[PDB]
Amino acid sequence: YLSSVSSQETQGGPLAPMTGTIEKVFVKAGDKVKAGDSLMVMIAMKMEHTIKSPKDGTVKKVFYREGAQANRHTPLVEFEEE
Amino acid sequence: YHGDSVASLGTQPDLGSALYQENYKQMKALVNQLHERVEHIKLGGGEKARALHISRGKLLPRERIDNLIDPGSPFLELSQFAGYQLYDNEEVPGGGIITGIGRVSGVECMIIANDATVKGGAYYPVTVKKQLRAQEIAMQNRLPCIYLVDSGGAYLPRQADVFPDRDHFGRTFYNQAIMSSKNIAQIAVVMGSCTAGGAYVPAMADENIIVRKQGTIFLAGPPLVKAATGEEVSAEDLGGADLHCRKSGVSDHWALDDHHALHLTRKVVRNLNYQKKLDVTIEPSEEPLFPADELYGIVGANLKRSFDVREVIARIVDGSRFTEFKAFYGDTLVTGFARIFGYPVGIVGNNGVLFSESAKKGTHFVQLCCQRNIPLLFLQNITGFMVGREYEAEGIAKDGAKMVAAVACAQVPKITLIIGGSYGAGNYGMCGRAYSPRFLYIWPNARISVMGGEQAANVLATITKDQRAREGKQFSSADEAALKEPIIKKFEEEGNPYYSSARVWDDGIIDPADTRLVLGLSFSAALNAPIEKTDFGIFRM
Amino acid sequence: YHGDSVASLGTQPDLGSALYQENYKQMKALVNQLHERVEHIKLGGGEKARALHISRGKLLPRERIDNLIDPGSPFLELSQFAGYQLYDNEEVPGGGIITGIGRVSGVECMIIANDATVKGGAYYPVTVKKQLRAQEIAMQNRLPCIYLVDSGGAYLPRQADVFPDRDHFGRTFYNQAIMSSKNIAQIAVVMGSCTAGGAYVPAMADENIIVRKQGTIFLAGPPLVKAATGEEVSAEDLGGADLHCRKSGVSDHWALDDHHALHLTRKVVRNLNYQKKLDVTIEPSEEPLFPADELYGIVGANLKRSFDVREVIARIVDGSRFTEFKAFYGDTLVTGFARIFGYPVGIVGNNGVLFSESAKKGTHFVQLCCQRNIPLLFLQNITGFMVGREYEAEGIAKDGAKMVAAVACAQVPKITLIIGGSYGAGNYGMCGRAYSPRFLYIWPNARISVMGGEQAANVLATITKDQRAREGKQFSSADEAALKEPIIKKFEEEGNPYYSSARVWDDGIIDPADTRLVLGLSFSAALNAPIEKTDFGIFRM
Amino acid sequence: YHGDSVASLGTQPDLGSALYQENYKQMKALVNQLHERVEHIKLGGGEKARALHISRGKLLPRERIDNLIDPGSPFLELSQFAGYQLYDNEEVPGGGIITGIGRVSGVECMIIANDATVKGGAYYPVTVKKQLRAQEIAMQNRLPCIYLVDSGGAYLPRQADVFPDRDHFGRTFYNQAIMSSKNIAQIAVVMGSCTAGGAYVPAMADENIIVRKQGTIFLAGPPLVKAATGEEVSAEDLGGADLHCRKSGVSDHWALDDHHALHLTRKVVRNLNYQKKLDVTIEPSEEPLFPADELYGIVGANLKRSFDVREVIARIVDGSRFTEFKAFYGDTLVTGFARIFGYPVGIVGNNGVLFSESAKKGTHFVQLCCQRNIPLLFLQNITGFMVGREYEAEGIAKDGAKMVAAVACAQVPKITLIIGGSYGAGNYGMCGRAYSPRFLYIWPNARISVMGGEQAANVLATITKDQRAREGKQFSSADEAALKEPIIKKFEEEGNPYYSSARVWDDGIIDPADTRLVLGLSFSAALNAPIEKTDFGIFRM
Amino acid sequence: LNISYTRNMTLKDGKNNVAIAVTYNHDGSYSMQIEDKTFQVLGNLYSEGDCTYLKCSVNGVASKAKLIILENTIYLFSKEGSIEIDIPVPK
Ligand SMILES: O=CCCCC[C@@H]1SC[C@@H]2NC(=O)N[C@@H]21
Ligand SMILES: O=CCCCC[C@@H]1SC[C@@H]2NC(=O)N[C@@H]21
Ligand SMILES: O=CCCCC[C@@H]1SC[C@@H]2NC(=O)N[C@@H]21
């Protein structure tokens, strides 16, 4: 729990903060990312939110593309099991 | 046993990131702007007025405070920007009065000094409000009041806003009488002329000190005496230290000069037979694990961008240690326990739009703190309440009201810090000015109004688009900005921190790097009064 | 000035004496019997149940307590023998629940943990009584309650003795609500399944912690959901940490495993903002001047032989220092002032049959202790009241009632230790269970009943000797033991310490060598609550 | 101004309807069964015992009460069915004790009289519980206690269930001492023999009365005196009025016969210097607008059928006037304000399965009544909580707990009436016995248990159908009723009102036509004590 | 808050009154201006034996001296010399 490996375990995947349009996607289908790497930018009720990488795991897949409307708490990125 | 290792908040920001570079640059400019404006206010009336003031043998108002407080002790000044551009053609630096909390003879006291270099010390409407705010702070925290009296009376051209009403000049004496009845010492130091209502201040004080020649105390001034009775008498003869000290008896102590009077004041406070007692548990202080100046890059000046409030918390609490309460429920609100300079504190901060879950989570947290007698700190960065047909059907208003009602009834000391927007009913739920927080501070990037400037513009752009679509004369897009641009300008101007602070809506605009120090001083002062039991109303389940 | 030399109690026993050798041997066997029985109870349900419990990733109930309390701190377990042979064919080690007082984050707390290895954590009638006793102790001493919840619900075959009455399972939630209203923290840690009434425990707690996958909370279990609505849902989906933590909001903290939950619990207690304050004067502690294990030889196991209670006192009080009150008046009762671990205590102990003088002497002493707010310790070794025509004519009942009435109204903390017999009204006068002593302990040689076994036998041997002498059919001596032997067997069996302790009549059976330590821990816990003023009734002079 | 016209509850039932005819017939049979059983209990021990009792010049226990209370005043007897078939081969009518509330010299008092015709007045385990319940009622309502003492001591064959524990015989003297310290008068009238613990009752009383020859007080009886000291002494010489009145001094008043003693008791109560004061507003009484006996047809004896609880309310409240609170929200629960005999009352009654909305509605209502100090009346007819995956996800347990916690902390007088089923946690939320309602009554058609008999049968029919389906040996439908029939029989037998009332779980079984009168008497008695302020715990929002 | 405190302090060397303006810097250093010259001074008090010693740096030059303050006189004893400075007494 102190090791912070737990911080990765607390949530399996990053979800959409609110229902909003996806304005930017910074990750390809297979991309190596480190914690704090921005994955997507979403505007909700004219308010910009940037999604950030939870773990250093490589990205297995992306559930949304640019211009898509993503509902609140819907998975945005799939990460390869390690 | 306190040897358990625990997790700590905060993360290292990306200093190389363009966003951090831009945010730091913008926030730094605001802080520099704030600093230089205070420097100008520091000078009061000006060189000619200051030279005249010293030529009479009197100390400058800020030098008086420096000599009054303990050597090297910090001084927490309040409402430095009162009266900033408040009046069209008159400059009133600091409102003509200097108020703050400092340590005298080891006791925290409220110091209220007239600035005689500003309009001769006349009382403007903002001057009365600033003094009344200081008295309210002193009473709520049981802080002895020291009045360095050097005043020229009320400003006649604006008498209707000074004399008559409940919160007008008359309330000043009412507050003195009430505090005296509660054993909150009232000490007046007449270091200049006081006329009409001014003469009441030394008379209403528990102990009183007057300077040998500068001080004068007359209910009716020489000008009124001549008009009423046709007699010519000097101010010293009509008032003066000798007359009051030896004949009238209004004076309790007689002082040779300003330095002597300040020395006497320190002796008076030392004889109050008061000792501070703490109701809360105390733990050794620890510095935060992250630099405070990083708040510049993290927060910036763009309210549209969002940041994690936990980052702000990580840089002000002891050791960056924070126990979050209901972390995964109502995540738009952050609540938890921490310690600042050893004091226990419950922190409530906005992290997004308020929801029904967030309001319920806040209401639960506030009850916990009140039960354990833990001071509460609010970090307002609001953007409104959730808007939707379903949310109203589920009683979002009912949930939001639950929090307004718990916050109002809480009797633990409450301090509010506006680090972002403050709009609509979100202000009330987060302990706005109307809910009597012990102190209220704002960062230089804050905005406050009934609603955001854009929302008012868009709302009107619906009403008049409707007005002409339903009426039938077409209303074009260029007609839209002849509607929207004046509204946005008004809300931007009236929501500015200086506009809010010029009037006394907050207790000051503070540099983010100074947030931890200001909170530490404020909570320390608020602990001078015992914490009472909290009685709640009906919780509308 | 505390430099005065004083006399000390106690004398060196004759180790060579045959009586001492026999008494030591008998008492040692009882202590060894007590130790090995506890070892068996320590294992709970058994190897198969324990192996299954660990296979699910859960800690054993006693390992949870070890990790919860401060490192190396003593743990005062209560009612270890609850349910010992209570039910005909079912073995319920410790009643299926572990209760005791330990230090968490430097604060004394009451810990109530279900033993899931015993009948899957089901609530037997004794289980409810043991928990209710623990809650009563926590409330009377203002000890925060920590519930390590892992339960399987009520035991249906015995529902009538669990559900309905005032002191049945429903009272558990009533106690939680009352303690919360008094600011006695209620903390629940869901480390397993809780169903039906069990789900209320986390809901009724001030702060709540649930494990990631093991914990489950639901008013209606999956079996009831399927029967009522014909839906199949797993326990995790119906309950679970994630549902309650993130959606239901029933969970205040989310824990990965048992170790994480225990770490979180320690943090929660540290934020209670509580500091212990003592109402009594304190003096440095000193060990008794005589070994405690000598109590084996002095006391023995034969209740017919008599010993000087002063010898017991000399081996438990600080420095074996004792100030006797009214030493030569009513000598069958010993009263005096001493100190245990620095705390002041007034000791009342039996030294023979109670007389009118003894009762008066006790009543006078109890008033003294209540006036000075001194805790009271009772050492019950009774053999009855004086029997005689003259004594009744002089109002022995009136005198005995004086003591029952003073003891009942006393508001100072009271602790009772049964070191011998406890029969009839002598039990009431010496602060029996009915008189709400903060704690009640018994030595392994004690006997308790309405009257001594022999007296009941002899009394019946008068009634039926009369029955047949007065009726006229002769009743012979062999007919006498067909009357007396069953009675003596019954009273011996029902007066046994294990019989008394299996039901919750006392808080535990303690080794005499541990008497001083147990008293020190108990009095320390009892001092967490402020001592109130004592209001007495009418003293029937 | 109270002249406003208002709506009234209730509707005229269809007397011709077959359902009404059947329901009336079934309920009438139950009431007739209840009446004739009480008639038998009225006779106590029997003709031979009653003839022997009168032959000694003593009044019968119920004749004593008739002469003690004011002429023509109603007498509220409690727990008439205690001990009904409780013991296998022993008949103990009324438990050997008669308890109730009546008016003596214009003051409401609790009367506790031993029935000497029943087993010679020996104390059975139920006898102790009945007396302890009476003392609890007297203390909670500040009712003076009058003990008509004629007892034969504890029942030795069952001593383990009488003597030792906290709620055993010893608690009786503890209660007397506590009430005396609170200025709740304790009056004892020795109208017969009292031995061993019995002798303490007159000794522990504030004022005491003894009959000339019948009464006897001694710690040790003649049989014990002879065995201990070999002396033969008559009971009168050992005890007796003359010895205690003139020599021992245990007696405060000396009475010639039973009639004289009862006359003296009335004089003693008149000198208590007590006057009743009401904390609540009072309005003139009005009879309900509908006959009470119609409740027979409306309710019936079939718990599976449902009825509108408003119909029950319309026939017991003054003028059938009722102000419903949150009528359309959580409609399965009915809450509102009414008046019974002029007293204000808040009524909570079940009208279906409990839901989240119902629990929230109840919690809101209970806070309202506590704020205004309004007595609360609960009408329990429960069938369980809503069962469903969605309901658990929405925290039905969290909502249900809100009500258990509000009801427990409420300090207004609470009275519970079970007019139907009482199962599971629904019992707790509706102020069950465990939640200390001032009084608890049940109708002859009620059923109470941990769960309904059918649910326990069906649940087991899932567990063992699973047991053999999963194991693989088939378990047939005939194997199902070899499982279900014994369970249903057990729950039917143990949920019967007589089973519940034989043990003291309720204060009596009452005829529905008498509901209004019983409630009026009960609320009137409960108002003898001042209403305290209610302190709530944390409401888990 | 938002400004720096400058203390005006007067000490007397021989018969000459000297006015020193000390600004208390945020870092804990003090900037002192005497006449037209500005000096950056940082220092601490440490005790060796029964004598308090002042370790100080003025404009980066570092020195150690024994400090005794008795009556209205400040005595600094160093190897380079002993200086006695006077504190003016209020009227
Ligand atoms: O009204 C004009 C000025 C001179 C008369 C005013 C009188 S003097 C007595 C009284 N006290 C005042 O302050 N004003 C009036
Ligand atoms: O009665 C047999 C089992 C299925 C029906 C029981 C119902 S479901 C709704 C209500 N809540 C309970 O716990 N039991 C009843
Ligand atoms: O033990 C057998 C009966 C006679 C001896 C009992 C003694 S008499 C003194 C004391 N008081 C009692 O009630 N019992 C014992």
Distance from CA of C4 to the nearest CA of D (A): 41
CA distance B322 to B308: 14
Q: Write out residues 3-62 of A within 8 Å (CB-CB) of C.
A: 6, 9
Residue C242's nearest CA partner among B328, B189, D362 is B328
Which residues in chain E have Cβ-Cβ distances shorter than 8 Å to B80? 1-2
CA distance D217 to D202: 8
- Report CA(B442)–ligand 3 centroid distance (Å): 84
CA distance E16 to B52: 28
Is C61:C116 a contact under the CB 8 Å cutoff? yes
Say which DSSP state C196 is in: G
Q: Write out residues 9-28 of B within 8 Å (CB-CB) of A.
A: 11, 14
Torsion sign over Cα C88, C91, C96, C102:
positive
CB contact set of C87 (below 8 Å; sequence gap of 6+)? C124
> What is the residue with the minimal CA distance to atom 4 of ligand 1?
B228
Is D142:D528 a contact under the CB 8 Å cutoff? yes
CA distance B201 to B195: 10
CA distance B83 to C89: 86
Is D338:D64 a contact under the CB 8 Å cutoff? no
* Phi (first) and psi of residue D473, to 5 degrees: -80, 130
Helices B258-270, B61-68: inter-axial angle, 10-degree rounding: 40
Chains C and A touching, counted as 3 or more CB pairs less than 8 Å apart: yes
Type of residue numbered B344: P
Burial (0-12, 13-18, 19+ Cβ within 10 Å), C17? exposed
Residue D238's nearest CA partner among D253, D220, D256, D254 is D220
Residue E32's nearest CA partner among E59, E3, E14 is E59
Residue C403's nearest CA partner among C383, C384, C429 is C429
Give the CA distances from residue B384 to residues A19, B114, B424, in Å, rounded to whole numbers and listed in that order. 16, 41, 7
DSSP-assigned states of every residue in C4-48: -----------TTSHHHHHHHHHHHHHHHHHHHHHHHHHTTT-HH
Residue the block writes with tokens 């009839």: C424
Tell me how far the alpha carbon of residue B351 is from its chain's centroid.
24
Specify whether the backbone of C244 is left (phi greater than 0), alpha (psi in -120 to 50) or beta.
alpha
**Residues pairing with B422 in the sheet:** B448
**3-state DSSP call for residue E18?**
strand
Is E8:E21 a contact under the CB 8 Å cutoff? yes
CA atoms within 13 A on the CB side of C162: 21
CA distance B488 to B454: 6
CA distance D129 to D123: 10
Residue C251's nearest CA partner among C308, C286, C324, C199 is C199
User: Can you point out the beta strands (E) in chain E?
Assistant: 6-13, 16-24, 30-34, 37-48, 51-58, 61-70, 73-78, 81-86
Residue ranges of alpha helices (H) inside B305-452 are 309-314, 356-372, 389-393, 396-409, 424-429
Instruction: Residue C185: count other Cβ atoms within 10 Å of its Cβ.
Output: 27
- Report CA(C379)–ligand 3 centroid distance (Å): 21
Residue B14's nearest CA partner among A58, A37, A56 is A37
Would an 8 Å CB–CB cutoff place A68 in contact with chain B? Answer: no
Note whether C245 contacts B280, CB cutoff 8 Å: no
CB contact set of D234 (below 8 Å; sequence gap of 6+)? D222
Residue the block writes with tokens 């307590």: C65
CA distance C335 to D398: 53
Note whether D539 contacts B538, CB cutoff 8 Å: no
**Residues pairing with D340 in the sheet:** D343
Which one of D387, D460, D488 would you pick to mutate in the ligand 2 pocket, going by the greatest count of ligand atoms within 8 A of its CB?
D387
Distance from CA of B533 to the nearest CA of C (A): 11
- Report CA(D380)–ligand 2 centroid distance (Å): 17
Q: Which of B368, B538, B541 to mutate to test the interface with D (most CBs of D within 10 A)?
A: B541
Pocket of ligand 1 (CB under 6 A): B 220, 224, 227-228
Residue C78's nearest CA partner among C102, C61, C59, C60 is C102
Is E84:E73 a contact under the CB 8 Å cutoff? yes
* Phi (first) and psi of residue B524, to 5 degrees: -60, -45
Which residues in chain B have Cβ-Cβ distances shorter than 8 Å to A34? none
Residue the block writes with tokens 């389940």: B541
- Report CA(C99)–ligand 3 centroid distance (Å): 39
The tokens for C341 are 């671990």
Burial (0-12, 13-18, 19+ Cβ within 10 Å), C118? buried
Please tell me the experimental approach by which this structure was elucidated.
cryo-EM
Is C308:C323 a contact under the CB 8 Å cutoff? no
CA distance B411 to B433: 15
Q: Is the CB of D124 under 6 A from ligand 2?
A: no
Torsion sign over Cα D466, D471, D475, D479:
negative
Note whether B541 contacts D539, CB cutoff 8 Å: yes
- Report CA(B222)–ligand 1 centroid distance (Å): 12
Q: What radius of gyration, in Å, describes the C-alpha atoms of chain E?
A: 14
Distance from CA of A82 to the nearest CA of B (A): 24
**3-state DSSP call for residue D161?**
helix
Helices C170-181, D396-409: inter-axial angle, 10-degree rounding: 70
Instruction: Residue D67: count other Cβ atoms within 10 Å of its Cβ.
Output: 15
**Cβ density class B125-139: b for 16+ within 10 Å, e for less:** bbbbbbbbbbbebbb
Note whether D364 contacts B402, CB cutoff 8 Å: no
The tokens for A78 are 């799939």
Which one of C387, C449, C460, C480 would you pick to mutate in the ligand 3 pocket, going by the greatest count of ligand atoms within 8 A of its CB?
C387
Measure the CA dihedral B380/B384/B386/B389, to 10°.
Answer: 150
Which residues in chain B have Cβ-Cβ distances shorter than 8 Å to A47? 304, 306, 383
Q: Which of C273, C274, C275, C276 to mutate to test the interface with B (most CBs of B within 10 A)?
A: C273
Would an 8 Å CB–CB cutoff place C465 in contact with chain A? Answer: no
Torsion sign over Cα B217, B65, B507, B95:
positive
CA distance B316 to B312: 7
> What is the residue with the minimal CA distance to atom 10 of ligand 3?
C384
Consecutive H or E run containing C97: strand C97-104
Give the CA distances from residue D469 to residues C17, C225, C436, D466, in Å, rounded to whole numbers and listed in that order. 71, 20, 53, 5
**Residues pairing with D149 in the sheet:** D190
CA distance D194 to D205: 14
**CB-nearest partner of E3 from B39, B76, B260:** B39
CA distance C237 to D390: 10
Type of residue numbered D453: G
Is A57:A33 a contact under the CB 8 Å cutoff? yes
Beta pairing, strands D97-104 & D107-114: antiparallel
For chain B, the residue count is: 541
Q: What radius of gyration, in Å, describes the C-alpha atoms of chain C?
A: 26
Is D265:D238 a contact under the CB 8 Å cutoff? no
Which ligand is in closest contact with the Cα of C384? 3
Residue the block writes with tokens 């002029």: D342
Which one of B218, B224, B225 would you pick to mutate in the ligand 1 pocket, going by the greatest count of ligand atoms within 8 A of its CB?
B224
Helices C170-181, C125-141: inter-axial angle, 10-degree rounding: 10
DSSP-assigned states of every residue in D200-231: HHHHHSSEEEEESSS-EEESS-HHHHHHHH--
Instruction: Residue D420: count other Cβ atoms within 10 Å of its Cβ.
Output: 24
- Report CA(C220)–ligand 2 centroid distance (Å): 10
The angle at the Cα of B131, spanning B130 to B134, to the nearest 5 degrees, equals: 90
Is C146:C68 a contact under the CB 8 Å cutoff? yes
Burial (0-12, 13-18, 19+ Cβ within 10 Å), B152? buried
Which residue of chain B comes nearest to C107, CA vs CA?
Answer: B1
Torsion sign over Cα C247, C253, C254, C258:
negative
CB contact set of E47 (below 8 Å; sequence gap of 6+)? E53
Residue C441's nearest CA partner among C504, C508, C362 is C508
CA atoms within 13 A on the CB side of A44: 20
> What is the residue with the minimal CA distance to atom 14 of ligand 1?
B228
Distance from CA of D59 to the nearest CA of C (A): 27
Give the CA distances from residue B99 to residues B102, B155, B507, E9, in Å, rounded to whole numbers and listed in that order. 10, 20, 10, 24
Compute the 3-state secondary structure of chain B and give helix, strand, coil in percent, each to the nearest 5. 45, 15, 40
CA distance B417 to B401: 21
Which residues in chain E have Cβ-Cβ distances shorter than 8 Å to B444? none
Instruction: Residue B233: count other Cβ atoms within 10 Å of its Cβ.
Output: 14
A-B contacts at Cβ under 8 angstroms: 19
The tokens for D329 are 């929200």
- Report CA(C437)–ligand 3 centroid distance (Å): 27
Would an 8 Å CB–CB cutoff place E2 in contact with chain B? Answer: yes
* Phi (first) and psi of residue C200, to 5 degrees: -70, -30
